[PDB]
Amino acid sequence: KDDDDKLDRADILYNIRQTSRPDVIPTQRDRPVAVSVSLKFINILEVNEITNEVDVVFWQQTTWSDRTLAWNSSHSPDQVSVPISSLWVPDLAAYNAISKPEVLTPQLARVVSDGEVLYMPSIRQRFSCDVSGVDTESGATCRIKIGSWTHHSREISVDPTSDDSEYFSQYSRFEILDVTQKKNSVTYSCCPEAYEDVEVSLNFRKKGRSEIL
Amino acid sequence: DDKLDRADILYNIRQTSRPDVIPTQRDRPVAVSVSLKFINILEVNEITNEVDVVFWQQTTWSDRTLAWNSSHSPDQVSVPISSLWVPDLAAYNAISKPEVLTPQLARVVSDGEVLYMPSIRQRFSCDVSGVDTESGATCRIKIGSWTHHSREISVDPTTENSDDSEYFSQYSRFEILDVTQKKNSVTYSCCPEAYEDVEVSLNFRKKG
Amino acid sequence: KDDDDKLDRADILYNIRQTSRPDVIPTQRDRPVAVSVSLKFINILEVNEITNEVDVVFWQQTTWSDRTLAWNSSHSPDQVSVPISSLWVPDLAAYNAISKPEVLTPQLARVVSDGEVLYMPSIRQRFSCDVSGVDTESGATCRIKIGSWTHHSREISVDPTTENSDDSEYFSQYSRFEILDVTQKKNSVTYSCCPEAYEDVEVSLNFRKK
Amino acid sequence: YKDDDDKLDRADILYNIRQTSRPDVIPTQRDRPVAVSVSLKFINILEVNEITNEVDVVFWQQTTWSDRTLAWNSSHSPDQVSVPISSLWVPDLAAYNAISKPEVLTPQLARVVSDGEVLYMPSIRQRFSCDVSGVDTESGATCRIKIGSWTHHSREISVDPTTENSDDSEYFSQYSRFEILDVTQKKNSVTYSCCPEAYEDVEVSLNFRKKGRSEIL
Amino acid sequence: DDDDKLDRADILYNIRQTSRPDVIPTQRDRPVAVSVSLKFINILEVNEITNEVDVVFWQQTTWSDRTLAWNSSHSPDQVSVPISSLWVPDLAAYNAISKPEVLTPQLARVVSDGEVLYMPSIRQRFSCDVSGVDTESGATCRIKIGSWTHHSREISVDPTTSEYFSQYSRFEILDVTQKKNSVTYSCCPEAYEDVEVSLNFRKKG
Ligand SMILES: C(=C1/CCCN=C1c1cccnc1)/c1cc[nH]c1
Ligand SMILES: C(=C1/CCCN=C1c1cccnc1)/c1cc[nH]c1
Ligand SMILES: C(=C1/CCCN=C1c1cccnc1)/c1cc[nH]c1
Ligand SMILES: C(=C1/CCCN=C1c1cccnc1)/c1cc[nH]c1
Ligand SMILES: C(=C1/CCCN=C1c1cccnc1)/c1cc[nH]c1
Predict the structure, then answer these.
(1) At a CB cut-off of 8 Å and minimum separation 6, what does C199 contact?
(2) Which of B63, B80, C21, C151 is the most buried (most CB within 10 A)?
(3) In which tissues is it expressed (chain C)?
(4) Residues with C-beta less than 6 Å from any ligand 2 atom
(5) What DSSP state is assigned to residue E3?
(6) E95 and C42 in contact by Cβ < 8 A?
(7) CA angle at B4 for the pair B3 and B8, rounded to the nearest 5°
């Protein structure tokens, strides 16, 4: 009932900008920042079986908490939209991306009165992954690994939260069999740091395939 | 055309404008009217079900806090959109960034109405089958606020049906049979919020 | 003889930045701002007769006046270069452009002591226009329509030049195409919905494949 | 390590770095050149054009140097923080044979270590003019990439390799059309007969080949 | 003294206090003398159908601004400076058909005597006669570089009075000339001083 009180929203934005530290990780209770990531695939635009590359569009549902941003919403809006330039956002990258992430949507996040932040850009991006079997019944399984680029596991944990039937375009030349998203840890022989990431396994295949029976 | 009046109006708008806060008046959602006027259909890819199009995105809404008495001053001024709140519209089936081809200025009217109408080039995933037939193809584009649900913003059409004869290029390979624009509400199973959108059905065919 | 007086130039630039209102149309008295636009074609890069599209490069000579910027040049520079971010510039758009105007050149304008402003970017841009006849002796005639995007005729008037040429001084000798004629006609656009009229110049590019 | 998640500590370190940092001045200590270490970890080879002698590749550019004025005592505070590169001096590296801008695929953050070490490792997609002859043979092609400071000569910046040899097995995509045989990185000093200054660069030699070189037809 | 950091910071501070990035550094009420020399690095994406060519070149650009000079008897002789802190000539390739792609860090060198050197590596496309590219006589590209907005009374742009070209280009250079040229248009009285660069090349073989 108080959502549409403009002055209240303006004051909330003011409060957020006073407290927000866009360049500092919001670690609370001496624990790493728990970042949840879930990709909702919207389309598969191009796949190349020779080069093992895919071109896809997905909604990157990204959530985390910063309780320093919280406010009492007993008589004020429960949520507001905030430009991400005013907020800290996780420095996520896909390890096997071969193009820049192209953000297709307005760069606004939602901040909830309990301090939860939700940012969900629609991203088009190209990846190097296993496209073998895309023209078969069992299809291909393209794996995409996403994690913090510069923050190791003691600082940020990136965690997962389907056939994406609610999201995936019915007009794609491909169809999604299954999308699994699992916790994964990465370490390199040179160095002690581990990186937490989510491994997204996209199992898909070409629609209306012609087979030899 | 009184320059000092215009400068003062712009000053006033910038003193009052809150570019990041939705202009909810009373305790109601912001009513955003959107109407796409198609100008060109550049490419139609039957292999991939994709279209590349150019359209004017006629967008209007009110912010009465911007209003002024224009009895003896200009009725409207042009304002850079960076000085204004503008709705965070996005097309759900866009597969490229909206490319704005025109100067990023809005008109503000002395009654507080704002008109923003970018020319946009953008690619979409949609049903392209039938494009070379009498019935044509019907490509549906859903547009709405990306982050504001129905209690905060309503996105509504103006003209429900039009052949865009005043807008669409006579030199295109294609012709417009009908552009239908209707209110549409989207909810996802995961969450309670609804998003109020305009569903734009672009029915077009290859000229022959 | 005072053009290269550096302190003079710095002071002129200072004065312009004190006076200039980059977001307000420089209307003088009770009249629209008169804007002249002349396209000088450098090249025609690609033409598609099936889709009726062209890819061109041109110098967009744009002139207007803001008398509030004028100064007494009797013992100072006649002109200076000014970043366009410091100036009001006409919000011109090509109504049949199908790509963003790509500016190839430094974004500087000239301001003359009498208040004339000249901005002439080199632009690469694609258009939807009539390419029919490009392979004939008479060639194709592609019309490019340019006017203010948000200012109607009471606020900005776009006045065509009286020039008639094949742009021999500008156009690449090595283009696959040849320009037969480039002309401009004043035109006014109105839509049935609304009373406002928008002034434009229609630039007619008559060209053919060599 | 126990203090890594102390948020106020991190904010204060960032403030300190921003008070001390001179983003446009080389961090010369004593009167010695800034020692810049560079190591390219190749991830993908996207395109190899045998007609034109061009390659399009993705690599992680591991770049390290020291600015001891940024150091702090981390006995009871975070050992490292992430910092936007706009707040830091970064070496003005360029590849002499690049034919496209470096496209940075990742967030533009560096790590600053409490001893003053800085680590910046962007993933970069870039195109190069190099020798691709032999890519379809057993011995492969060897594409050499020369990287150095664009405007600082050897008295001001030295650009040196880290690891001499590797097949990048931990980094290179197993799904590429190509496979890496060896990546060698050597110091190289370049002077032009016109002028006296020398530029101290790294020559990166990427020896790679197409998989499945024996085809039917 | 070159690697004295505080000295370098102070020089940068001094340059920024005196630099007027938007005002031409005309001295003695004479035009700014800008010297330009292109070093060709590569010839790429040559299209014989469309008569277009990509070139990569280092654009060696020098001029002086004596107000930037300092006494370097006990301090650095030279420093690197972001070009945003300096006036730089507004050079353009008048005839180019693509945006210049600057491939290198946008830093200039400032010498203690006030000399400035800026040398971007640039990739850019041009309209050229490519018809003879596979013949002994070859193809020709003409590139005209000058100030975009400053005429000859304000800026003079003159040519400076195998080490660089890629050994892996498909093409080889037959000749390069870089000549003083003054460009005037029938419509208007101003002349623009430019360097006319003629690049003659052919496919190897
Ligand atoms: C660096 C990694 C691995 C995980 C991805 N990000 C980073 C990173 C770390 C720090 C700064 N920038 C990027 C690395 C892996 C081996 N040696 C260095
Ligand atoms: C999010 C949606 C759906 C409507 C489009 N915008 C949003 C959105 C909402 C909030 C922030 N950014 C985008 C969503 C989440 C689960 N399911 C859909
Ligand atoms: C708007 C037009 C037509 C001329 C082009 N610019 C505008 C415009 C006007 C105002 C703001 N932004 C663009 C329009 C509206 C209905 N019919 C045409
Ligand atoms: C310039 C060189 C050497 C190659 C690398 N960088 C530079 C450089 C030097 C200074 C500023 N910007 C670039 C040069 C000049 C004549 N010959 C070579
Ligand atoms: C203008 C030229 C020719 C040389 C290139 N720059 C300019 C210029 C001059 C002023 C501002 N912006 C560009 C010109 C040529 C014929 N009529 C006008």
Answers:
(1) C147, C148, C153, C156, C157, C158, C159, C186, C187, C188, C189
(2) C151
(3) Expressed by glial cells.
(4) A 61, 110, 118, 120; B 146-147, 188, 190-191, 195
(5) T
(6) yes
(7) 120
